[PDB]
């Protein structure tokens, strides 16, 4: 017994629901990823931009002393550079999905600048490598090797 | 976090069941979940992910779905270096550090930046950090060479079959997490996943401490493949679970034991009362419907009361203090559930904080210790009831100070408050036995408290044709200033009134409140 018939989008659209849940319909992969980028930027853009800023190792530069130690942690562990490497090392198809996702964010911000907090404007535009750099911080340098276990603060 | 997958044999209708149930901070920005649905001519994925991630970690669709829990996979090592002559001692000889001169800009009060120099030193292990106390520490993180994390998740969550799923998982690009799988074909899987260094000696505790940084003996270079890791597929028990417990009771009956794996992979520590309930809730129930499966997810038993109050109460009634006596009778009459109307629950929590520590994980108070041979019924009892009564005495004082009374309704102190929404709490601390988790803050001066951590994204999916799923996001789908989609779900959470998750086009169209046409050109 086969599943229900899969849906074939004919146009790129986000149908949002009453709870602000995006249903992103793309005619191909980069399109859906772009929609997804747009949506995430709408619902969470400010904090996403701040996080990407940090994972560039630009926390201290964009936002001063409160962000300095995470900056030292990520530079010392060569995170922003490694993310550029991992980005180049992506498969062509998936790398294109990432560029699209990043393009969605940039496009939402460009079309809706009022929605973007003054303090995170300087981070734009964001790149495929930003997207890889944040995921890399999250998995390896928050989950696996937290600054606390190494520095002995907890 | 909790995770359940249930095989068709254990269900009434003959379709697998899956629970996604991550517990993370309600405030930490990178821990914020977002719910979305992506549809192309070639794939479809529904579910939640941490903000800024382009792939859905908690995904399902018409064919399959997965969920995650923290396993603490030890994928890094911290080494204590022995400094000598500007280098470090290593295999009997002094070895110079690698060093580069980096720099960064630091924003000033007046909006300018200053360039600050940053020397980066490394040993053969990795980058070197100096601790506040002077300890030179080198950190060695495994899997710095797996650029494929996101694509693996992507290929996992869009897998056309379990073999494809397993093939993707086997790439070893996701460095951590228990990961649980289910599908419409009827397969369920549990994997203890991560990128684990192959080491010759040492248990997990050895590898979590400062490993000596003076010998190549400890400088690992290889990591384990997937089939070295604890895994379970379609066990005779008909379910798998994980609730952050060591992977030794992922199902019942178990399919392996700690001896089957290197001792540095997972701890062998007592399983939390929450984890014990997880096993019980699945094993003891059969012929499950999705409705019943949802009802079981809401469990909020004070298992610790079950283990302790039989010894505590009689000992407490012996005490000359009338207020201790009254406290004992209050506890005695309690049904042992974290409900809103409970007059005893707050008092019990305050006693357990002293009995079992602030985290409720302490073991030294129990009469019978935990044993993997009785993994859902130990530890048990009160070892020193006289001491425990003194703890009640203090706890009575603490409860009155924190909450104004020893019998304030649980749901009156325990509120979920987002924007202008303020609703009664139920459930509570995982380590007290509550499966559905709300890690209540310390109270304000009024004795009111709110979840710092707990239920965030919650979904339960039946892999029927079409699939049928329900979910809620505690803190809404948005956090942008002025959004109407921050506090619009917490009221439904207070009543456990789950949204039907909408995957079918017809359903999406019926529910649409906003359309955003877009177009992408690279």
TrEMBL record, chain A:
Q: Which UniProt keywords apply?
A: Hydrolase, Periplasm, Signal, Zymogen
Q: Which domain of life is it from?
A: Bacteria
Keyword Membrane present in the record's keywords: the answer is no
What Gene Ontology cellular component terms go with this record? periplasmic space
Drop me one GO molecular function for this one: hydrolase activity, acting on carbon-nitrogen (but not peptide) bonds, in linear amides
* Any single GO BP term: antibiotic biosynthetic process
Q: Give the primary localization class.
A: periplasm
Compartments it resides in: Periplasm
Family listed: Belongs to the peptidase S45 family.
Q: What name appears for this protein in its UniProt entry?
A: Glutaryl 7-aminocephalosporanic acid acylase
What organism does this protein naturally occur in? Pseudomonas sp. GK16
Instruction: Indicate the span of the full protein covered.
Output: 36 to 189 of 720
């Amino acid at each position: 017994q086969a599943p229900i018939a899969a849906y074939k989008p004919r146009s790129n659209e986000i149908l949002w629901d009453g709870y602000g849940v995006p249903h992103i319909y793309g005619v191909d992969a980069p399109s859906a990823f772009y929609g997804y980028g747009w949506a995430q930027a709408r619902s969470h853009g400010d904090n996403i931009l701040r996080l990407y800023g940090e994972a560039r190792g630009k926390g201290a530069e964009y936002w001063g002393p409160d962000y300095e130690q995470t900056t030292v942690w990520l530079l010392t562990n060569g995170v922003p550079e490694r993310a550029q490497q991992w980005y180049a090392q992506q498969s062509p198809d998936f790398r294109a999905n990432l560029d699209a996702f990043a393009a969605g964010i940039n496009a939402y911000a460009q079309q809706n600048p009022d929605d973007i907090s003054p303090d995170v404007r300087q981070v734009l535009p964001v790149s495929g490598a930003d997207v890889v750099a944040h995921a890399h911080r999250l998995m390896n340098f928050l989950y696996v090797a937290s600054p606390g276990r190494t520095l002995g603060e907890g | 976090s909790n995770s359940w997958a249930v095989a068709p044999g254990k269900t009434a209708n003959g379709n697998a069941l899956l629970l996604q149930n991550p517990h993370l901070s309600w405030t930490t920005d990178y821990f914020t979940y977002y719910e979305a649905h992506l549809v192309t001519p070639d794939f479809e994925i529904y579910g939640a992910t941490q903000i800024g991630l382009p792939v859905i970690r908690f995904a399902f669709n018409q064919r399959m779905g997965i969920t995650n829990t923290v396993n603490g996979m030890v994928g890094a090592t911290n080494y204590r270096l022995t400094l000598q002559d500007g280098g470090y001692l290593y295999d009997g000889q002094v070895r110079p550090f690698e060093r580069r001169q980096a720099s960064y800009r630091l924003r000033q009060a007046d909006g300018t930046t200053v360039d600050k120099p940053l020397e980066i030193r490394s040993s053969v292990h990795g980058p070197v950090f100096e601790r506040a106390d002077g300890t030179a520490v080198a950190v060695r993180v495994a899997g710095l060479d797996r650029p494929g994390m996101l694509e693996q998740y992507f290929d996992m969550i869009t897998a056309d079959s379990f073999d494809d799923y397993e093939a993707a998982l086997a790439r070893m690009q996701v460095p951590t997490f228990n990961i649980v799988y289910a599908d419409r074909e009827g397969t369920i899987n549990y994997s203890f996943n991560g990128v684990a260094p192959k080491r010759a000696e040492g248990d997990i505790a050895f590898w979590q401490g400062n490993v000596p940084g003076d010998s190549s003996r400890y400088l690992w270079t290889e990591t384990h493949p997937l089939d070295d890791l604890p895994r379970v597929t379609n066990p005779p028990g008909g379910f798998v679970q994980n609730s952050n417990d060591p992977p030794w009771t992922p199902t019942w009956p178990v399919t392996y034991t700690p001896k089957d794996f290197p001792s540095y992979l997972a701890p062998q520590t007592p399983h939390s009362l929450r984890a014990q309930q997880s096993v019980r809730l699945m094993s003891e129930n059969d012929d499950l419907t999705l409705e019943r499966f949802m009802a079981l997810q809401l469990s909020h038993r004070a298992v610790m009361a079950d283990r302790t109050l039989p010894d505590l109460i009689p000992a407490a009634l012996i005490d000359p203090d009338p207020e201790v006596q009254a406290a004992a009778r209050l506890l005695a009459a309690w049904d042992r559930e974290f409900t809103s109307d409970s007059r005893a629950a707050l008092l019990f929590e305050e006693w357990a904080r002293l009995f079992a520590g602030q985290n409720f994980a302490g073991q030294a108070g129990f009469a019978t210790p935990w044993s993997l041979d009785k993994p859902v019924s130990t530890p048990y009892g009160v070892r020193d009831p006289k001491a425990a009564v003194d703890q009640l005495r203090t706890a009575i004082a603490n409860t009155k100070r924190k909450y104004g009374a020893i019998d304030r309704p649980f749901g009156d102190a325990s509120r979920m408050i987002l924007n202008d929404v303020n609703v009664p709490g139920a459930a509570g601390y995982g380590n007290l036995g509550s499966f559905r988790v709300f890690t209540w803050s310390d109270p304000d001066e009024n004795g009111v408290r709110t979840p710092v951590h707990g239920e965030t994204w919650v979904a339960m999916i039946e892999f029927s044709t079409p699939v049928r799923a329900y979910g809620l996001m505690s803190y809404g789908n948005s956090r942008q200033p002025g959004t109407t989609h921050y506090s619009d779900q917490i009221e439904r959470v207070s009543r456990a009134d789950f949204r039907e998750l909408l995957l079918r086009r017809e359903q999406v169209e019926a529910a649409v409140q906003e359309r955003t046409p877009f177009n992408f050109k690279p």
